[PDB]
Amino acid sequence: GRAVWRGPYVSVSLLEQVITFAKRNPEWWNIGRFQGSKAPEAINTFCRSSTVLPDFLGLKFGVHNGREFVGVEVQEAMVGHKLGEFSQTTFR
Amino acid sequence: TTKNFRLRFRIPQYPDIVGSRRIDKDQTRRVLYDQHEVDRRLYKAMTRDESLTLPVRLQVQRLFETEMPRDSAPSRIVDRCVLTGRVRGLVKFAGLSRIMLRQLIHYGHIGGVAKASW
Amino acid sequence: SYIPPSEVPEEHLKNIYEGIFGSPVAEFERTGRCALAKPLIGTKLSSYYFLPPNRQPGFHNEEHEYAKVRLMSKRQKK
Amino acid sequence: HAGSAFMVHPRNAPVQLDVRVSDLKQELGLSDDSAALLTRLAGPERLDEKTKRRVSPCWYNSEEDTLSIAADRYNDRESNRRLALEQLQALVKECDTRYPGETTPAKQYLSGFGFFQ
Amino acid sequence: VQIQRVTLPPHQCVYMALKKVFGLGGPTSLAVVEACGISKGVRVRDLKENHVQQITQFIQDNFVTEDNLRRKVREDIVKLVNIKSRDGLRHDWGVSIKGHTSCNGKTAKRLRH
RNA sequence: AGCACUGGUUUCAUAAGCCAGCU
RNA sequence: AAACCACGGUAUUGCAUGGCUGAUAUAUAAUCCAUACAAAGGAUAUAACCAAGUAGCAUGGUCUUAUAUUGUGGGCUGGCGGUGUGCUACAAGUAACAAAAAGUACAACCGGAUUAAUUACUGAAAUCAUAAAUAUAAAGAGGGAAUCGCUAGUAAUCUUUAUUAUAAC
Ligand SMILES: [K+]
Ligand SMILES: [K+]
Ligand SMILES: [Mg+2]
Ligand SMILES: [Mg+2]
Ligand SMILES: [Mg+2]
Ligand SMILES: [Mg+2]
Ligand SMILES: [Mg+2]
Ligand SMILES: [Mg+2]
Ligand SMILES: [Mg+2]
Ligand SMILES: [Mg+2]
Ligand SMILES: [Mg+2]
Ligand SMILES: [Mg+2]
Ligand SMILES: [Mg+2]
Numbered sequence: 221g222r223a224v225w226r227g228p229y230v231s232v233s234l235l236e237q238v239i240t241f242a243k244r245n246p247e248w249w250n251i252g253r254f255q256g257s258k259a260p261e262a263i264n265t266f267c268r269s270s271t272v273l274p275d276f277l278g279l280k281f282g283v284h285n286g287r288e289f290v291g292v293e294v295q296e297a298m299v300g301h302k303l304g305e306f307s308q309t310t311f312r
Numbered sequence: 313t314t315k316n317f318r319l320r321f322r323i324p325q326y327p328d329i330v331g332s333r334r335i336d337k338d339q340t341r342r343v344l345y346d347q348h349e350v351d352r353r354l355y356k357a358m359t360r361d362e363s364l365t366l367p368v369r370l371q372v373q374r375l376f377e378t379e380m381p382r383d384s385a386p387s388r389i390v391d392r393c394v395l396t397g398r399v400r401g402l403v404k405f406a407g408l409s410r411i412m413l414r415q416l417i418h419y420g421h422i423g424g425v426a427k428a429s430w
Numbered sequence: 431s432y433i434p435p436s437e438v439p440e441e442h443l444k445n446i447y448e449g450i451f452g453s454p455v456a457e458f459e460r461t462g463r464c465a466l467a468k469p470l471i472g473t474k475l476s477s478y479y480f481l482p483p484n485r486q487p488g489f490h491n492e493e494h495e496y497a498k499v500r501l502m503s504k505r506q507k508k
Numbered sequence: 509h510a511g512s513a514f515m516v517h518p519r520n521a522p523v524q525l526d527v528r529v530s531d532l533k534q535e536l537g538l539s540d541d542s543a544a545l546l547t548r549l550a551g552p553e554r555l556d557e558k559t560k561r562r563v564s565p566c567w568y569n570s571e572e573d574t575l576s577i578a579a580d581r582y583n584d585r586e587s588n589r590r591l592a593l594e595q596l597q598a599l600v601k602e603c604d605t606r607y608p609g610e611t612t613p614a615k616q617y618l619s620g621f622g623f624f625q
Numbered sequence: 626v627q628i629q630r631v632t633l634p635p636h637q638c639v640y641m642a643l644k645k646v647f648g649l650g651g652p653t654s655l656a657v658v659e660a661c662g663i664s665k666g667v668r669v670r671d672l673k674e675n676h677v678q679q680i681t682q683f684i685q686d687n688f689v690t691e692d693n694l695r696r697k698v699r700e701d702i703v704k705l706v707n708i709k710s711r712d713g714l715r716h717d718w719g720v721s722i723k724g725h726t727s728c729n730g731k732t733a734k735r736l737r738h
Numbered sequence: 739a740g741c742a743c744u745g746g747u748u749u750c751a752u753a754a755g756c757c758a759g760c761u
Numbered sequence: 762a763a764a765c766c767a768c769g770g771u772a773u774u775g776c777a778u779g780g781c782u783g784a785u786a787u788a789u790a791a792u793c794c795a796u797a798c799a800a801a802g803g804a805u806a807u808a809a810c811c812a813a814g815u816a817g818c819a820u821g822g823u824c825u826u827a828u829a830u831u832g833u834g835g836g837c838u839g840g841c842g843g844u845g846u847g848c849u850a851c852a853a854g855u856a857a858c859a860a861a862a863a864g865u866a867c868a869a870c871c872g873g874a875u876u877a878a879u880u881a882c883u884g885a886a887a888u889c890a891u892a893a894a895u896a897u898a899a900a901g902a903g904g905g906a907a908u909c910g911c912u913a914g915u916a917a918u919c920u921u922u923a924u925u926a927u928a929a930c
Contacts, residue, residue, distance in 0.1 A: 223881065223882075224881090227369065227370055229887090231377070232374050285834085286836075297704060301888070304888075304889090305711050305712075305889090306710060309839095310835095312840060315763070315767080316762055317763070320767095326818095328780080328819045329493070329818090329819070330818065330819080333771085333817095335481075336762090339479055342476045343476050346475065346476045352885085353468075354466075356465040356884095357464075373885085380885085382886095385886090386926070387886095389475065394480040395818090396817060397817090400817090404925090409817070409818095411817060427793095428805090429804045429805040430793065430794040430804060435541045435544040436548075443548060443549055447566070450598050451595065458881090484762085484763065494767050498767065500820095637866090637867080644870075650896060652895075665865085689896095698876085698878090698896095701877055711889065714840090718840050719840080721875075722876085723889085724839095724890095726838090730840095731874095731899095732874050732876095733876080735900080736899065
């Protein structure tokens with residue numbers, strides 16, 4: 221994968237989406253997210269190649285798969301992977 | 313109304329007029345890459361310089377997207393035949409597709425190139 | 431003390447040599463010099479296609495003339 | 509060449525400088541130690557095995573007893589000659605300082621200039 | 626002679642015999658014997674009780690062995706299945722994880738978990 | 739088990755013939 | 762993007778056509794490789810029945826402002842069956858390892874597939890690219906009916922180069 225000494229990749233567009241979300245919901249971002257409350261809304265994105273951050277913990281992401289935005293709620297075990305690994309593009 | 317005529321060449325070396333497809337768009341990408349070549353090299357050096365603290369290197373990484381378009385990336389440029397625009401079967405040293413190159417060689421329009429046997 | 435020329439460390443010789451003629455770049459360095467040492471190819475790429483001007487001053491446009499003959503050689507449309 | 513009016517051939521710029529060590533020692537009055545140090549600094553030519561292309565700017569040939577310097581940094585023929593001449597003087601200054609030797613009119617002439625460094 | 630409850634053939638060299646332990650191979654087996662002062666010329670039948678004890682103690686302190694190693698690998702696979710990533714689904718389905726395996730994927734089919 | 743079936747092989751191709759697998 | 766404008770189309774008819782090509786292949790040659798201190802073998806060229814093939818390109822008829830031109834992501838790689846062309850092996854130890862204790866290991870520890878953790882490299886971007894290393898150590902003990910290549914520097918077997926961001930069996 222990407223060389224560890226060069227760091228991760230995260231898209232700039234994804235960061236802007238999260239920053240706007242935090243401003244809209246300051247109370248949940250600071251306190252609610254850690255007591256266990258669910259996110260008040262979801263963030264739709266096309267950034268399937270971005271890495272999942274633990275600051276994205278309790279966040280709900282709608283990841284595009286070609287047709288719709290598949291909901292993905294971040295868990296601790298999903299840390300370190302790409303958003304595109306949890307949104308399937310083919311169906312049988 | 314407005315018109316955009318297809319790119320065609322009439323040359324005495326070929327009995328028929330030669331048309332091409334999709335050369336203008338690739339020329340636009342080549343110009344954009346040259347426009348942003350200097351900045352790209354500077355940021356490549358900084359992002360692969362181990363002497364810098366990464367919290368600075370991460371911020372430099374974000375400049376590849378905010379300060380230049382995606383179409384200035386050198387990896388998205390392809391080589392097309394200068395006469396027909398065909399991508400597959402290109403002969404790089406001449407810049408022409410194998411279909412055009414073979415016929416021109418037969419009539420001696422390519423300097424120094426002739427049939428071989430051994 | 432007198433140090434014979436045949437007993438000088440190679441490190442000092444290398445520093446003198448590279449201090450005058452420059453330091454070469456190794457295959458895999460992390461100093462950010464490989465990017466700046468590669469030649470620029472911006473002009474070589476943007477002068478690849480054969481794109482002569484559509485209208486050359488003082489000459490006829492053979493492609494335009496070719497099209498006009500084609501229209502006259504067949505029946506008109508609509 | 510046929511394309512001379514459209515592009516400048518890349519091989520017009522490079523220049524090379526050759527000097528015989530025996531004559532150089534006599535002219536500047538270099539001592540035996542200084543000459544030995546100069547040969548060690550130059551060393552044999554190094555050619556990469558991938559392309560068999562010389563990569564050593566300076567090298568010494570024992571059969572011909574010749575010290576050679578190649579200069580191709582710049583795009584101009586003359587700018588490379590100025591670069592090559594300066595580098596040759598730098599080598600002489602370093603070797604002479606470590607192992608001073610006899611004084612000759614050439615050495616005195618260079619000393620007044622300061623070896624142009 | 627048995628180490629980690631694996632019987633070592635008597636006529637084979639010690640560093641060759643230790644490969645039968647799940648979790649030790651050629652390069653690592655040679656390291657263990659040499660760390661204990663055993664060269665390549667020593668055979669299993671030439672070992673003594675003290676030599677066996679030194680090897681057993683060294684292995685337990687440095688390497689993960691049969692039962693613990695198998696558990697660790699399985700837990701790694703199970704985590705992917707629960708995460709429901711692309712690789713996890715392939716493990717659950719019993720097929721290879723490579724992109725194009727509609728023509729040759731037999732080995733992954735007979736080595737399911 | 740096996741007849742039968744199933745997949746092939748042969749032929750320009752169908753059929754026939756042939757070979758395995760399987761119940 | 763073009764002004765007494767030459768719109769565009771990977772839309773259709775290869776059974777309306779141009780050009781180019783597959784398809785008989787002996788024999789011959791003021792042609793090419795090699796040759797100069799004694800030789801052998803090849804390459805290239807040589808007019809076709811087949812309504813054979815043809816969204817590279819050009820063209821008659823028909824269709825279409827737009828069946829045009831464009832942005833982001835996804836697909837061409839798709840949980841199943843059949844099968845063509847290749848590579849790597851195993852019967853046969855004439856194997857395997859190797860820097861010879863004139864050797865080392867084993868008695869198909871021959872074979873190197875699959876998967877887990879880790880790191881490097883290229884690139885704006887690497888889960889669905891490549892390489893190395895540690896662990897894991899699968900099928901395979903010479904293969905039915907049937908079928909293919911070749912007749913000497915040939916088959917067989919071994920190494921290397923080129924087309925050529927990363928990426929050849
Ligand atoms: K041969
Ligand atoms: K192959
Ligand atoms: Mg083992
Ligand atoms: Mg279209
Ligand atoms: Mg036809
Ligand atoms: Mg037909
Ligand atoms: Mg055909
Ligand atoms: Mg796209
Ligand atoms: Mg395909
Ligand atoms: Mg064998
Ligand atoms: Mg082996
Ligand atoms: Mg055998
Ligand atoms: Mg077996």
